[PDB]
Design a protein around this ligand. Sequence first.
Ligand SMILES: CC(C)[C@@H](NC(=O)[C@H](CS)NC(=O)CCC[C@H](N)C(=O)O)C(=O)O
Ligand SMILES: [Fe+2]
Length: 329
Amino acid sequence: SVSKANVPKIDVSPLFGDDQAAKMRVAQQIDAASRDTGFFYAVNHGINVQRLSQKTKEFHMSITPEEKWDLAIRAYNKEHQDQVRAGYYLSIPGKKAVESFCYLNPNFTPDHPRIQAKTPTHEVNVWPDETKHPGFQDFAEQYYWDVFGLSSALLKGYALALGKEENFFARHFKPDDTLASVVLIRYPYLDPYPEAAIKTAADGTKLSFEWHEDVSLITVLYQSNVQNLQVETAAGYQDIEADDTGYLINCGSYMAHLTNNYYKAPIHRVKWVNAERQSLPFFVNLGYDSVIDPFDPREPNGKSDREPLSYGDYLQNGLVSLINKNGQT
Ligand SMILES: CC(C)[C@@H](NC(=O)[C@H](CS)NC(=O)CCC[C@H](N)C(=O)O)C(=O)O
Ligand SMILES: [Fe+2]
């Protein structure tokens, strides 16, 4: 029936160091994975993912309907016209199973010039009451900078893999303006499971979320130990095995654009599984005005005829497009 994808485990610890040859050997493994299925697991990453999962569970399982309305994005609460990205994405009992909480750069405050200018895709995070969820905000903001650090190191690997100096991507990935987001997704156990929340793929597979390419430069994902992801290959969809100690990494469609599809954005989908689990992506986005001149690693000169694409315009279009194709999450 369904084969299993080759997803290598890459020790990324050299990318935090100064052994340049060891970093090249990591870059080679990133290149090979990016040209095969497009996924790899980053191991020896140094992030306490046990505390991540525990604090996230405590939040999902203790927030009340009252608090969810207070935090809801505008899709679920007409009063919150300024919350398009950041806030709570409600489940709909009997109809929609998944629920999530999304937050952005903690440096996006009312004092931030992008917030003053009302620039699209920039928002101030909303948080639950500290007394009802003690330590949650402190944990979540710290985690943002923890995975920001991991992501910066990974971008050095991708740069070296493509033959560029190690700051080629990372120089556009800055704490003061990154549009990167964390999403804390709960997939619940439900009995009976609402049929409306299950989609049937063309090939008969039951899905929670249909095929898509990620709107990101790269995606840095922690999931609990329940198998669910599939990646499309020419020979059909292949199962991605779960590993709840590592981060699963793949390219988004901005990487595909700027490399002239040398590193494709892998198409993937989420199988339906009736099990309580967590999916915690960090979407590595650059700044609103970040532009990287596209290039083609296949050509000696590296010349490409693709237009440079501003990351802000890419992100605004891509988020809307994904909602329109696969539905409001
Ligand atoms: C496949 C996983 C990453 C996860 N899916 C997802 O997170 C899906 C597909 S990548 N992503 C989205 O809907 C885009 C969220 C963007 C976010 N609100 C923002 O403003 O930045 C899942 O488990 O459903
Ligand atoms: Fe995805």
